[PDB]
Design a protein around this ligand. Sequence first.
Ligand SMILES: O=C(O)CCC(=O)C(=O)O
Ligand SMILES: [Mn+2]
Lengths: 428, 18
Amino acid sequence: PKLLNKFDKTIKAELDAAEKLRKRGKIEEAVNAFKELVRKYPQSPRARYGKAQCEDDLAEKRRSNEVLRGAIETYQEVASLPDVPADLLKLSLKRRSDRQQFLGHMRGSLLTLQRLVQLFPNDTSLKNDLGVGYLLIGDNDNAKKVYEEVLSVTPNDGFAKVHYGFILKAQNKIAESIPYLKEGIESGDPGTDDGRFYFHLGDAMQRVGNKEAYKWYELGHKRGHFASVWQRSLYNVNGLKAQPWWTPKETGYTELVKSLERNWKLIRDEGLAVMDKAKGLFLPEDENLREKGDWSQFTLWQQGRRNENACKGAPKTCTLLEKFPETTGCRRGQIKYSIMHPGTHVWPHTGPTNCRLRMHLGLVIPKEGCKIRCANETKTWEEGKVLIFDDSFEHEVWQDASSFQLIFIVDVWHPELTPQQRRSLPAI
Amino acid sequence: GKCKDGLGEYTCTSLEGF
Ligand SMILES: O=C(O)CCC(=O)C(=O)O
Ligand SMILES: [Mn+2]
């Protein structure tokens, strides 16, 4: 890595002495050392990079967003100086984008990634990084165009293949996504050994009837991406008790279960009133999990936040639930009504995290035609009764009754999570 | 997009700095 331009080679001793202080952890000393070099040599790219790296380390030491924003600006200043070596220009801008994504400046990161692709049009990995920037903001269309542009030039790039297959699979192009996902993982290129790609390759194969799907779930399990072949959530706290079905006593949330079962008719009645008078509050499930039929949900809580307008449609239910922070505070779960009509089948699927358990309170359950499978066991609901399963295990639902099914879904923190973990875990 | 019922999104969390 050639980081010194012609002038920087003539002050190589001073630059190495300052950088050695930063590698030793003397951050304040290194900050002032590079500050002096930037003063004496205001055009030095290596001195400016040292200033930025020291601000980067100082932000880590302080866990300070404001200090990191200063580092992000100094990484920019490096790129603005004359005669910046190509290796240094790329390092400074790549770190800038990486730190912008850390702060959540996803739009700003995108501008930095685009500039990197403009400066180095032959670096295919920078285009792949740009595609990740689009994926992080939720712009799958522009991400798809980026990887198609990469695959036009380098068809064998494994990173581009998995991410293209991921985009195709997200767009419900199930059959088309399989060879891109498969060949991408099989390439072994950096960035392809990711749990997201084993998860969706196996799921795509499941939807098309490919029996080789669980071979890829076992390979993902062997490489540390899945807790097991059945439990394939990707946002896990390791060690939590893993079983598909739970009894109320096993969860310890016996007071919540008692309240739901004592008061279930007021929950049902408000759900029915929304069906009859405000049906638009039920939104069709839009995560591509419905194989066929009609499936909608009316969400009262998500990420531990109460939807005020929705609770105006179920005020008594929300009042009852407010007494139970184990569900209203579950920032990795929801509280929602769920309606499924006859002819509905939900693809086998897995929730995102092992940090929640999912309760179903039966509200309107037809006598025949409705069942839910979790892992190897299929069960039925009962009106006014709570069943509890871990939806990080593969589960599946059928609705073949002659009228509608209505349930109340109440997520709780996994009981083995400490109060510390419940406060700090990022919301999902 | 949010990962409520599944894992369809590229990332399911939202980074907001330290
Ligand atoms: O999500 C629903 O409403 C349907 C049942 C299900 O898949 C779940 O509770 O995770
Ligand atoms: Mn589910």
